[PDB]
Amino acid sequence: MSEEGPQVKIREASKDNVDFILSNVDLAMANSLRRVMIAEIPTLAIDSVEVETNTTVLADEFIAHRLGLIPLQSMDIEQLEYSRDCFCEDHCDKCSVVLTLQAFGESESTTNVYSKDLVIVSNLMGRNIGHPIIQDKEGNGVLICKLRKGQELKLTCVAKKGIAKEHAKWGPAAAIEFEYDPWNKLKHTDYWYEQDSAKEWPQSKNCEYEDPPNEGDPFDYKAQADTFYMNVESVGSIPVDQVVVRGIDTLQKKVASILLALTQMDQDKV
């Protein structure tokens, strides 16, 4: 309850998904928030891989791509500086995290390599970043590659800050459900009925949640979309609530940067 701005209502919450309803908000703001949440949150991922010995049956580029696709902890990501903005040669402790992976084949059977085998050799300085995310009952994590007896894998990886816009490996959200107006009260779409619209088109699960069914009343031309049902799913690097908070913060920061640029250009003009 803060002013007459947008209102929220959380339906279901979990460790990986959050369900909420957006009210008293325009469609453009919700779409911008969704776009920011899917392609603007800064995260941490492996960007540079140095290979020493690779005797496995997989190519070096294959393993590099697989390692770059592995999610990493990014809770304290605001304390890490961008590599381009950092005063260093390649990477230091204040702008990157170094991880080393060593695998060897001892047993006769196949020896799998998991994301839990990654070891952080850099200094985190107390920051909660760089730890691989293991959401599994067995605790093994993401499978990287399989090697038999004799084969040896040894490489070093460097993790750097980035956003999903540059590469899809930096995206913290998997899929975001967006829906509004479960009934066709706004007439924003025309259905493809062959015999009847109601029977052929299944009813959405959000029909019961508010939005009473329409009657034979005249069409309302003064109504606008103001209620939105959203479900945000997180990969695991960032909590869902933190994902939404960081999306709102990023949108606010972008608008504030636009305002600052406008003020600077006004001052320069005068």
Partner: protein
């Protein structure tokens, strides 16, 4: 007789920070450096990129004028 010829180098600053490449051609203050992971050629100032050893070791700045060797 340029020293920065056929030597493994690492690009610092700019948008190619941390990349590994080998110098190919030098044109005055600008030098053409290839890329290992990326299949493209980029031109940057020779005084910017650091210099490494062919086998591998410590990296140094453009101070290689006083020591016409690798590393």
């Amino acid at each position: 007789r340029e020293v920065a010829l056929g030597k493994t180098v690492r690009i610092r600053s700019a948008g190619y920070k941390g990349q590994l490449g080998i110098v190919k051609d030098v044109n005055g203050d600008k030098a053409t450096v290839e890329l290992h992971s990326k299949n493209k050629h980029i031109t940057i100032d020779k005084h910017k990129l650091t210099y490494y050893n062919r086998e591998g070791g410590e990296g140094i700045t453009y101070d290689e004028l006083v020591n016409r060797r690798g590393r």
